[PDB]
Amino acid sequence: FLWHGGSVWDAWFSCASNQVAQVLLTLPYSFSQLGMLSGIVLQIFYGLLGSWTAYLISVLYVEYRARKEKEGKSFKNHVIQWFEVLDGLLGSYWKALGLAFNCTFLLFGSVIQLIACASNIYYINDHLDKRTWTYIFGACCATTVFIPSFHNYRIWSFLGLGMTTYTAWYLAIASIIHGQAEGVKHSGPTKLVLYFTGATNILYTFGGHAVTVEIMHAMWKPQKFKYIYLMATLYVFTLTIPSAAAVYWAFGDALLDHSNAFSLMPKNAWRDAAVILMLIHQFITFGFACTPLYFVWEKVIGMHDTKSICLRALARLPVVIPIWFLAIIFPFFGPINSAVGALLVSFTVYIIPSLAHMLTYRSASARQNAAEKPPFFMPSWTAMYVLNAFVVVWVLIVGFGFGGWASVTNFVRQVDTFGLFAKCYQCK
Ligand SMILES: O=C(O)COc1ccc(Cl)cc1Cl
Numbered sequence: 530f531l532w533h534g535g536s537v538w539d540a541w542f543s544c545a546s547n548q549v550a551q552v553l554l555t556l557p558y559s560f561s562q563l564g565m566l567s568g569i570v571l572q573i574f575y576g577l578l579g580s581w582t583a584y585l586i587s588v589l590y591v592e593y594r595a596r597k598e599k600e601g602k603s604f605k606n607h608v609i610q611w612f613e614v615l616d617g618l619l620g621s622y623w624k625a626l627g628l629a630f631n632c633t634f635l636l637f638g639s640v641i642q643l644i645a646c647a648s649n650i651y652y653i654n655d656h657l658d659k660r661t662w663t664y665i666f667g668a669c670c671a672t673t674v675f676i677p678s679f680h681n682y683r684i685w686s687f688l689g690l691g692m693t694t695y696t697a698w699y700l701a702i703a704s705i706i707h708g709q710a711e712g713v714k715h716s717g718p719t720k721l722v723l724y725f726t727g728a729t730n731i732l733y734t735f736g737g738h739a740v741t742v743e744i745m746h747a748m749w750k751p752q753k754f755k756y757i758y759l760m761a762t763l764y765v766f767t768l769t770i771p772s773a774a775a776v777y778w779a780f781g782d783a784l785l786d787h788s789n790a791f792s793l794m795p796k797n798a799w800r801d802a803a804v805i806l807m808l809i810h811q812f813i814t815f816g817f818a819c820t821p822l823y824f825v826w827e828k829v830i831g832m833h834d835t836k837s838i839c840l841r842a843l844a845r846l847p848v849v850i851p852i853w854f855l856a857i858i859f860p861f862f863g864p865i866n867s868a869v870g871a872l873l874v875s876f877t878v879y880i881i882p883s884l885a886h887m888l889t890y891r892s893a894s895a896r897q898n899a900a901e902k903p904p905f906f907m908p909s910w911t912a913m914y915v916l917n918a919f920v921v922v923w924v925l926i927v928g929f930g931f932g933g934w935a936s937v938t939n940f941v942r943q944v945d946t947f948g949l950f951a952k953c954y955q956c957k
């Protein structure tokens with residue numbers, strides 16, 4: 530009860546901002562690297578852990594606002610940010626950590642959208658290789674230095690949800706109708722590097738929810754908290770499990786060579802519709818990631834105020850040129866999710882939110898005068914502390930130690946094979 534979350538519409542507007550658009554096409558690859566038994570258990574595991582960490586971020590936001598409003602403060606005409614909460618609760622070293630990590634991740638999450646945009650357009654008009662489509666789409670994305678901000682974020686998310694729901698159910702039904710071939714093989718785990726570069730792509734997937742609660746996070750007065758609101762957290766499962774299971778079931782071990790699943794499906798108007806919807810979706814996730822970087826760069830350089838559109842744009846172009854060169858040089862759609870999710874997501878989404886919560890409520894004085902008692906599904910404090918320590922140690926060893934070695938070895942293998950400035954990655 531009294532969950533500071535809102536009504537049914539705001540509650541579903543939080544599951545809408547659970548971006549799983551682009552990574553949806555690289556999950557059969559991970560299944561072919563792991564097998565059927567490990568692919569499902571790990572998806573459920575990481576989905577539950579992601580929901581837990583999102584809850585942690587929420588309770589920390591509420592704790593900070595509640596502490597600040599008591600000593601005398603007005604939060605009117607001023608939205609709170611993540612690094613501000615970290616600075617207010619822990620100190621300045623945490624304000625530096627939660628800024629460096631959240632800026633590096635936002636830099637590397639747009640290279641991926643540019644790569645995917647240049648990759649999916651190849652399965653409509655394959656007269657120009659993927660590097661020329663990267664030239665063209667980078668020149669198109671370098672025009673976001675003219676769009677100031679977004680006037681509305683509700684409609685974009687509510688349309689992205691449907692654009693994802695069409696593709697996640699085309700990929701399953703087309704694969705079922707196509708059936709199995711004659712002499713396809715489902716070999717499970719063979720090498721270690723492959724198992725652990727698949728597990729990290731699965732870790733990456735379920736950290737997109739908590740990453741938005743670290744940037745926008747709108748909150749308001751509490752409501753009565755109908756308990757049906759929880760049934761919107763487990764709606765990404767009907768998007769990710771059937772589509773990834775039914776493509777691997779049909780196409781076997783031909784997927785450890787094709788990271789984009791559109792390359793195996795038979796061409797039809799439905800496939801063309803899904804490519805276009807995915808392009809429209811991945812063109813929105815690029816601006817929603819490049820806007821905070823623009824804001825932070827303008828604040829840092831000391832030029833927040835600008836009246837002409839020609840001055841803002843011109844000053845705002847050391848931030849989109851490395852996002853372009855990095856997409857041109859390393860165009861590895863699918864092997865890059867593992868590296869990014871092993872080096873940045875494991876710290877941004879999992880270890881830091883659970884370490885801040887452990888370090889905040891250390892003393893009994895901080896635990897008796899708390900803004901929110903422990904939830905109904907976790908009564909004691911020892912339960913929360915044990916769960917946090919487990920999350921920290923697990924993501925530290927399996928997510929960073931093994932995942933890191935495996936994913937970086939795979940990323941270097943791709944460069945050894947295809948070279949730098951590759952012309953067409955995984956084209957016949
Ligand atoms: O389209 C994508 O890139 C997949 O969505 C995500 C998945 C994981 C994380 Cl951390 C962030 C995002 Cl935006």
Ligand code: NA
Binds near residue numbers: 863865
């Ligand atoms: Na991967």
